[PDB]
Amino acid sequence: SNINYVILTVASVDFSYRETMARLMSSYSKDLIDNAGAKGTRFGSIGTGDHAGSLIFIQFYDDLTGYQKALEIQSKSSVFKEIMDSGKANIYLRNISTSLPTKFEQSYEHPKYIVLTRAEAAMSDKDKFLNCINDTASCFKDNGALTLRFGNLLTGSNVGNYLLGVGYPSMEAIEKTYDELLAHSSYKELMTFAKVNMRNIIKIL
């Protein structure tokens, strides 16, 4: 119960409806934050990879009951109905991840960018993994990283993959983080037992 949960949803959206949608979604966020007990949300545009241009919504819950309450909010929500009736937004992926305890100094600052990284590794290496993450915590915080969350995808066609989400105020902070990170022993160790199979930048809208 020290474990938390993250819902990640991805939709293709007509380009014209993008700004409309971000405004509707902040309304929909306040509703989840106030009534479903959501511990924050993020909404942004995926900037990189094959889903570039898709929009992503991220929800944080302490327990899966929270998400279940969020599902009851959807059914009753006018803003949600409007987006689905528009015919301009198509949800094509939704998956849930655990969020595990890390030794990382969380900041309250809303990030402008998020880097999600996904990797394949044995479930038996879960602790090795967690140690590397904690050993490089200062690579991130020192170079401007705001938030760090880490866990495993519980659902979908990448079930079991480890996932890392890191919030930044700028792309400079990303560059400076990755300069240090790639020349750090714990990172080079990670690369002996974990295969990164995805890395992408989201722009918070």
How deeply is 145 buried, as exposed, middle or buried, from its count of CB atoms within 10 A (0-12, 13-18, 19+)? buried
Q: Do 13 and 57 meet the contact criterion of CB atoms below 8 Å apart?
A: no
Among 27, 106, 155, 185, binds a copy of itself (CB under 8 A): 155
Least Å from the CB of residue 76 to a copy of itself: 9
Check residue 50 for interaction with a copy of itself (CB under 8 A). yes
**What are the residues whose beta carbons fall under 8 Å from the beta carbon of 90, sequence distance 6 or more?**
11, 12, 13
Query: Considering CB distances under 5 to 8 angstroms, the limit depending on partner class, which of Cl ion, a copy of itself, none binds residue 50?
Result: a copy of itself
CB atoms within 10 A of CB 135: 16
Among 20, 26, 35, 45, binds Cl ion (CB under 5 A): 45
Q: Which is nearer to Cl ion, 45 or 134 (CB)?
A: 45
3-class SS at 67?
helix
Check residue 48 for interaction with Cl ion (CB under 5 A). no
Check residue 170 for interaction with a copy of itself (CB under 8 A). yes
Comparing CA positions, the residue from 163, 151, 167 lying closest to residue 202 is 167
Check residue 93 for interaction with a copy of itself (CB under 8 A). yes
How deeply is 199 buried, as exposed, middle or buried, from its count of CB atoms within 10 A (0-12, 13-18, 19+)? middle
| Residue ranges in contact with a copy of itself by CB under 8 A | 1, 3, 9, 15-16, 47-50, 52-53, 63-65, 67-68, 71-72, 75, 84-85, 91-96, 117, 123-124, 154-157, 159-160, 170-172, 174-175, 178, 188, 191-192, 195-201, 203
